Amino acid sequence: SKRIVQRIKDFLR
Amino acid sequence: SKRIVQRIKDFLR
């Protein structure tokens, strides 16, 4: 899921 | 990416 990956990336940035 | 999600899930299991 692109949505899920981007959410994790944004949480950790 | 389904693969990327599954990679993260597997790393944390």
Author numbering:
A (entry chain B), B (entry chain A): 1 to 13
Question: Which of the paper's sentences describe this entry?
Answer:
The gorilla LL-37 (gLL-37) sequence contains two amino acid substitutions when compared to hLL-37, with one at position 17, the first residue of LL-3717-29, substituting phenylalanine with serine (corresponding to a F17S mutation). gLL-3717-29 exhibited slightly weaker antibacterial activity against M. luteus compared to hLL-3717-29, with a MIC of 53 µM, similar to the effect of the F17A mutant. The 1.1 Å resolution crystal structure of gLL-3717-29 displayed a similar assembly compared to hLL-3717-29, with almost identical backbone positions and root-mean-square deviation (RMSD) of 0.15 Å, differing only in the two N-terminal positions that lined the central pore. The overall structure of the two is highly similar (RMSD of 0.15 Å for the asymmetric unit, comprising two helices and a similar space group and unit cell dimensions). The N-termini of the helices, with Phe17 in hLL-3717-29 or Ser17 in gLL-3717-29, and Lys18, line the central pore. The pore of gLL-3717-29 is more occluded, due to the orientation of the lysine residues extending into the pore. Similarly, the mean MIC value gLL-3717-29 (equivalent to an F17S mutation) is 53 µM.
